[PDB]
Design a protein around this ligand. Structure first.
Ligand SMILES: Nc1ncnc2c1ncn2[C@@H]1O[C@H](COP(=O)(O)OP(=O)(O)OP(=O)(O)O)[C@@H](O)[C@H]1O
Ligand SMILES: Nc1ncnc2c1ncn2[C@@H]1O[C@H](COP(=O)(O)OP(=O)(O)O)[C@@H](O)[C@H]1O
Ligand SMILES: [Mg+2]
Ligand SMILES: [Mg+2]
Lengths: 902, 441, 77
């Protein structure tokens, strides 16, 4: 009962920290507190865990009131919320786990036991308007709400003094290095709206177009020599400065004032109220005549979407839907950018949209829990892929948002959602994205929702603006070339499952173009070479032919080879070290894997069974160790051999991957600080084994455990994958991880035979090796293997994969006669060698076939090895006499048997 | 034979399943009303008159033509059968040939030869079957107290039942469904009306289908008490025992465009003069696009549903545009773009249909000096010195003065006559093909 | 088999010192595919037959196998 006693002790200590230490909270459930006190007294005097669980279940109303004090703390699970509540004086585990309440906010920079600033997930720092005193006796919720109000007012006052600095005439290069991205972004939006309105009061647009052009050039010139977080801020702000340039250029080209008024009404406009006494509600947004309220919530420096006209149309329809308190709905084919449109609309209003990824794993309870949380906070809830739920939970969730929207339209103060009365914030909105064509919105939801079918995004404009931000001098024509090439590839290549030539692939191309500029430069060559590095490995053979043809046709560059002779030499050194032979295709696959692992962390290697995946990545590992002089630590972990509890952990015993990650993170001996650590998942790809580690695959590079631990992953901790099929792999992970495809074996028959012979030798000796290698002549072997390929084999295995037996048996048989090789002639030795090789080829190639086919293959072997060689009879064998070996049959080996009756 | 035909009808759609006892009671109705040839003729008439109202218009025509074919096959000779089969073959474009010649046959020849597909399809109904049953005749001459009524979207028979509220002088209690509060309200009112009587209507039971699986299955001769259930023909499948225990009715949409304009204009109670004019133009545009929607292969590419929510959204947008304009310079391009792109064209995924909506908006919301809105009526712009009530009187007068022509599906909706002729050809072809597939088996 | 620690970390050894061991597996076709089209048993045997060892579940250590053989008889699929 030791585990039960430990659990009772932990529960009693946690509940004492939650309720016993703090007063004026025991008046809600006096019976429950009395029962807890009696249980604590019994535990001190001394299975008692069921009663504590029942008490904590009956204390949900007190927990509900505690969550009602600060609803952001509602977002965490019950266990982690109790962990925070129990630590009422340490002020720990609060700042490390608020990314799930505040969305894009990670940690708190607190000094001298007081709040100084806050740190987002992307790394941006916000300094508060004033410090907040932190004391042990102060409860978590009070200072949490104080910090929330403080950061909102700090964002507001940073916006205000950014507006003051910009209206004073100061340059943007001095203010972009001081305050957060949100403040400078909103100040720029307000100033741009005012300036365009002042220019619309007249008929001139050229001089402010030139001013914002010089501003864009100034941001680029500050960008090219800035720090990483400042680079992120400048890129994110350059997105909207290019948008403002586009808007002003469109307004300048208008023939009449009607077109100018139309285009100005279509785009989003930002206004500030200069007379209201309120602070957070002093800035609104006009779009198509409709008004929306800025929330001044912190967002950080996110991935800013490029403002295409269809994005503004989505903004306009979402504003039109929210003007009359209707829900939002987007539907269409996957890849049109619906969820990102909702997120960009939310973060363009300075607020964070809570995203629910709808799936079969998401049950009714958690969905309704998050829904009542977001309707008691006032946040915006976006349901991604809503059509991925079972009928009962679909109906329940549909009724829930139906009554939420019914309360929102009628202006109800409170809502009886989920059979409890809850506050209904008037700023709560619900959006739904759908992927139909494989259902659709239910009738109750469709009576109070606005469905919008957003089209495929303008890939030309998006690619052009991304290239312009990246500094390419020829951006429009190059982006048109890239999108036309991707369209040609999607129209001409085969309809493979893993092929993806959408906007995600194009943005991956443009992201991978960034490390390559230091060795190729801002030009078409960088685009061509990154396009090769990220598109070529995933295609077949004829698909690579088509890729090369349209690459030489569309793009003007012919693909000059780079300087990589040293790495090729190290590769050949590793190949001759391990016995591998370097064909052109094996070298191609090795270089593709090497270039893919230069940038992408998680690699997938896909091909037929025994096509050469392990040899490819092991040869690359050896070559890189020789090239860099850097250590290797390889953990070959089969995915499907170990179960989910054993691979990661069961609620606490650490799983294998979690244990090795903790061991490499701790680094007690310091060996891992100067080594490259590799995990090879040499098994089938499982959704339940990969989707359990999404947070490792993305840019977060953090492993999340069931108990809540967040383990960092080092940059050299490179994951590999080794499967044979991709029919059970999600398209998200395919696009997330690098993908290498083995369309054809990386060997010849003779090369594999030579490697197997060398491995068997390593596992008169030189004369024997020469005789064995010379007897395996290629001219007869190729013909005899083509002949064996036409046979019928049970459990059909490729003849290539059969080679691992044919060599390994044959030499061993010769090894079995290593004591009978100094007492015979050369002709007898050659006959014995030929007979043993014939027997091994028989029982490796045709050994999985019928007796008649085995005899036919015996005849074929005897004809293809010539009549000069010793004929392998159908029942021949080699026996050992008292002095020398001899050739005989199995007829003399048969012992007569006598059996009794019973 | 008739019951085999009706079973084949019910095999196509879940709403048309017929029970044997229904047919036997229908046969008893023949002797109820007030020699073997007359009994057979009354059998055909009574079966059609009772079981037509549970079928949509296409299946009404298919059923009528199949009963006419069966009766004339038994009664008339072989030459009549060959002639009728040639008419069906040329209607379905399967067999060609002149009839072997009877006024009815030569009138049918005139209908088929002059490409009058609707007249050729309705000739059977006009000639053979005499009595026609509306909603009131179905509800009055039925011993069942529970009625299920189904229809397509963009139409609802509920107001018709409100009309029936004045037919029998009974109060109708309309219950919306979709929420737990509405579910409890519906259960309480059902338990009240099962004792105290009164007509109860349930609006769009479909999204409460699971609750239909829970309550009505456990719930299914009071005075002045009849329960009406309204669902959708295109919705989810209703339970079979619920459908068999309730009398099934199908309600059919109006054939007029001007009636839709008048119906929309009679519900706009207010705003100045320009708001009234914009609401009138919006009612006209909504009626025109909703009339064009029903011609699914030609008027559009798919079957969209522009309900009254789109009208409310567009009216709100026009009110907001007119409110924020003090110079009386209406941005016609702005409202055209927001209506053809965001309000009406938002749900449309195709490009040709979006171009159709854009062209309709450009024709309607052009804001010219005089808007010839159809080939019939031209609307002049409002003057600057008129009251709003005078404007409502003027617009009501100009709606009452105009007359809907017989070719309103072509002139008013701006479609070529060839498209309408091809649509009628496809409709008659599908009717005759279904009837052929019934008759050969 | 016995767990010994002599060289190269842990090692699984046959109880006998001279005779090798053979892992007989009757009807290797009978283990069933999971919901995602894979058999745990044959991948375990592939790990034993190719990598010469296995990863243990409860304390995550690599066991090396040196003289244990694997045979199996099965009907056609
Ligand atoms: N360059 C080469 N020259 C000769 N033989 C080679 C070469 N590359 C690979 N091979 C042979 O290919 C064989 C296939 O084994 P390998 O470890 O590459 O398989 P794999 O790709 O991991 O297969 P699977 O995972 O489907 O079992 C090796 O045993 C090796 O003998
Ligand atoms: N205007 C835009 N600017 C930049 N990227 C965009 C834009 N619109 C869409 N994208 C990109 O398209 C990609 C595909 O979006 P996706 O996640 O498939 O949306 P959904 O799942 O709703 O179809 C996203 O990664 C996004 O980066
Ligand atoms: Mg999405
Ligand atoms: Mg492998």
């Amino acid at each position: 009962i030791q585990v039960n006693w430990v659990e009772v002790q932990f529960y009693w200590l946690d509940l004492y920290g939650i309720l016993g230490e703090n007063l004026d909270i025991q008046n809600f459930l006096p019976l429950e507190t009395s029962k807890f006190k009696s249980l604590t007294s019994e535990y001190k005097m001394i299975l008692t865990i069921d009663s504590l669980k029942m008490i904590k279940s009956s204390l949900s109303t007190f927990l509900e009131r505690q969550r009602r004090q600060f609803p952001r703390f509602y977002f965490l699970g019950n266990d982690d919320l109790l962990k925070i509540i129990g630590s009422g004086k340490h002020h720990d585990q609060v700042s490390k786990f608020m990314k799930k309440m505040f969305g894009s906010i990670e940690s708190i920079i607190f000094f001298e036991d007081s709040i100084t600033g806050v740190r987002s997930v992307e790394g941006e720092v916000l300094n508060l308007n004033e410090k907040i005193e932190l004391k042990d006796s102060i409860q978590a919720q009070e200072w949490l709400n104080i910090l929330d109000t403080e950061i909102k007012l700090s964002v507001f006052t940073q916006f205000r003094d950014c507006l003051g600095q910009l209206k004073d005439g100061t340059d943007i290069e001095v203010v972009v290095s001081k305050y957060i991205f949100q403040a400078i972004l909103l100040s720029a939006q307000v100033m741009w709206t005012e300036l365009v309105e002042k220019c619309l009061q007249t008929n001139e647009f050229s001089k402010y177009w030139k001013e914002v052009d010089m501003k864009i050039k100034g941001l680029l010139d500050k960008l090219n020599k800035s720090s990483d977080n400042v680079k992120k801020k400048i890129e994110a702000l350059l997105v909207e400065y290019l948008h403002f340039n586009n808007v002003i250029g469109q307004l300048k080209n208008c023939s009449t004032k009607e077109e100018a008024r139309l285009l100005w009404a279509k785009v989003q406009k930002f206004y500030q109220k200069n007379d209201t006494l309120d602070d957070l509600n002093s800035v609104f947004i006009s779009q198509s005549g409709y008004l929306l309220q800025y929330k001044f919530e912190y967002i950080g420096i996110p991935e800013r979407l490029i403002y295409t006209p269809l994005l503004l149309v989505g903004f306009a329809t979402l504003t039109d839907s929210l003007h009359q308190k209707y829900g939002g709905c987007f539907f269409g084919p996957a890849g049109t950018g619906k969820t990102e449109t909702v997120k960009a609309f939310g973060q363009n209003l300075g607020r964070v949209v809570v995203v629910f990824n709808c799936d079969d794993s998401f049950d009714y309870q958690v969905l309704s829990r998050l829904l009542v949380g977001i309707t008691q906070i006032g946040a915006w809830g976006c349901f991604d892929e809503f059509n991925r739920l079972d009928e009962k939970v679909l109906s329940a969730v549909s009724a829930n948002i139906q009554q939420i929207q019914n309360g929102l339209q009628v202006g109800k103060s409170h809502i009886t959602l989920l059979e409890e009365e809850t506050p209904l914030s008037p700023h709560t909105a619900v959006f739904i994205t759908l992927n139909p064509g494989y259902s659709e919105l239910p009738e109750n939801l469709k009576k109070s929702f606005r469905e919008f079918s957003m089209k495929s995004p303008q890939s030309g404009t998006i690619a052009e603006m991304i290239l312009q931000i990246m500094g390419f001098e020829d951006s429009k024509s190059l982006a048109s070339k890239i999108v036309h090439f991707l369209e040609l590839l999607s129209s001409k290549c085969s309809s493979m499952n893993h092929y993806h030539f959408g906007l995600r692939t194009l943005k991956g191309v443009l992201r991978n173009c960034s490390p390559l500029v230091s060795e190729f430069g801002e030009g078409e060559k960088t685009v061509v070479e990154s396009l090769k590095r990220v598109i070529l490995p995933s295609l077949g053979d004829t698909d690579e032919l088509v890729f090369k043809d349209e690459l030489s046709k569309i793009f003007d560059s012919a693909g000059t080879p780079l300087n990589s002779k040293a790495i090729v030499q190290c590769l050949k050194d590793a190949g001759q070290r391990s016995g591998f032979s370097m064909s052109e295709e094996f070298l191609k696959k090795c270089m593709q894997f090497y270039y893919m692992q230069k940038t992408q962390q998680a690699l997938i290697l896909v091909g037929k069974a025994g096509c050469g995946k392990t040899a490819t990545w092991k040869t690359v590992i050896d070559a890189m160790a020789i090239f860099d002089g850097h250590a290797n630590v390889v953990y070959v972990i089969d995915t499907k051999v170990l179960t989910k509890e054993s691979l990661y952990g069961s609620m606490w015993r650490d799983g294998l991957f979690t244990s090795i990650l903790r061991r490499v993170n701790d680094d007690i001996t310091g060996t891992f600080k100067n080594s490259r650590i590799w995990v090879v998942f040499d098994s089938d790809l499982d959704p339940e084994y990969v989707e359990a580690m999404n947070s490792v695959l993305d840019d977060n590079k953090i492993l999340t455990l069931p108990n809540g631990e967040r383990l960092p992953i080092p940059p050299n901790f490179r994951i590999l994958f080794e499967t044979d099929n991709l029919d059970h792999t999600t398209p998200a992970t395919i696009t997330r991880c690098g993908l290498l495809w083995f369309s054809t074996d990386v060997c010849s028959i003779s090369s594999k035979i030579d490697h197997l012979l060398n491995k068997s030798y390593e596992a008169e000796l030189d004369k024997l090796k020469d005789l064995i290698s010379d007897s395996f002549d290629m001219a007869s072997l190729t013909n005899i293997f083509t002949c064996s390929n036409d046979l019928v084999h049970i459990l059909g295995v490729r003849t290539f994969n059969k080679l691992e037996t044919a060599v390994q048996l044959a030499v061993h048989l010769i090894s079995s006669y290593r004591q009978w090789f100094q007492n015979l002639d050369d002709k007898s030795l050659k006959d014995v060698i030929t007979l043993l090789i014939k027997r091994s080829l028989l029982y490796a190639l045709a050994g999985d076939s019928t007796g008649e086919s085995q005899r036919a293959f015996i005849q074929t072997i005897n004809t293809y090895f010539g009549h000069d060689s010793q004929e392998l009879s159908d029942y021949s064998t080699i026996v050992i006499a008292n002095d020398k070996l001899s050739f005989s049959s199995f007829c003399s080996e048969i012992p007569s048997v006598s059996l009794e009756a019973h | 034979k008739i019951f085999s035909m009706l079973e084949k009808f019910g095999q196509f759609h879940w709403f048309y399943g017929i029970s044997i006892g229904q047919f036997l009671s229908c046969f008893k109705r023949v002797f109820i009303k007030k020699r073997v040839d007359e009994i057979l003729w009354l059998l055909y008439q009574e079966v059609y008159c009772q079981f037509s109202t549970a079928l949509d218009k296409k299946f009404k025509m298919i059923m009528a033509m199949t009963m006419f074919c069966l009766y004339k096959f038994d009664i008339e000779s072989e030459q009549y059968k060959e002639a009728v089969l040639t008419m069906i073959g040329v209607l379905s474009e399967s067999s060609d040939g002149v009839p072997k010649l009877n006024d009815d046959l030569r009138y049918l020849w005139d209908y088929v030869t002059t490409k009058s597909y609707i007249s050729a399809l309705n000739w059977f109904k006009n000639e053979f079957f005499v009595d026609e049953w509306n909603i009131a005749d179905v509800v009055a001459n039925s011993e069942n107290n529970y009625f299920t009524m189904a229809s397509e979207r963009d139409v609802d028979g509920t107001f018709k039942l409100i009309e029936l509220a004045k037919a029998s002088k009974e109060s109708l209690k309309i219950i919306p469904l979709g929420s737990i509060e509405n579910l409890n309200y519906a259960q309480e009112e059902i338990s009240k009306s099962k004792i105290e009587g009164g007509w109860i209507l349930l609006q769009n039971i479909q999204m409460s289908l699971s609750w239909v699986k829970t309550y009505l299955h456990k719930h299914v001769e009071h005075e002045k008490f009849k329960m009406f259930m309204t669902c959708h023909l295109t919705g989810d499948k209703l339970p079979a025992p619920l459908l068999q225990r309730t009398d099934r009715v199908v309600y059919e949409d109006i054939p007029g465009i001007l009636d839709t304009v008048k119906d929309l204009w009679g519900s706009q109670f207010f705003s100045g003069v320009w708001s009234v004019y914009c609401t009138f133009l919006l009612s006209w545009f909504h009626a025109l696009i909703t009339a064009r929607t029903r011609l699914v292969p030609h008027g559009f590419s798919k079957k969209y549903y522009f309900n009254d929510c789109d009208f409310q959204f567009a009216s709100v947008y026009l009110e907001n545009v007119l409110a924020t304009n003090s110079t009386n310079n209406i941005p016609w391009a702005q409202v055209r773009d927001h209506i053809a792109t965001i309000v009406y064209g938002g749900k449309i995924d195709e490009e040709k249909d979006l171009e159709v909506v854009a062209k309709l908006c450009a024709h309607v919301f052009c804001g010219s000096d005089n808007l010839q809105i159809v080939p019939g009526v031209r609307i002049p712009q409002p003057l600057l010195q008129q009251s709003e009530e005078e404007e409502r009187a003027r617009l009501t007068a100009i709606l009452s003065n105009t007359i809907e022509p017989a070719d309103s599906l072509s002139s008013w909706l701006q479609l070529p006559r060839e498209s309408i002729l091809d649509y009628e050809r496809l409709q008659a072809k599908e009717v005759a093909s279904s009837t052929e597939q019934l008759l050969q088996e | 088999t016995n767990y010994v620690t002599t060289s190269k970390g842990l090692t699984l050894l046959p109880k006998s010192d001279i005779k090798n061991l053979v892992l007989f597996c009757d009807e290797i076709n009978l283990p069933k595919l999971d919901k995602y089209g894979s058999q745990n048993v044959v991948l375990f045997l592939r790990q034993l037959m190719e990598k010469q060892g296995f990863w243990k579940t409860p304390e995550n250590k690599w066991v090396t196998i040196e003289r244990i053989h694997i045979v199996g008889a099965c009907n056609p699929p």
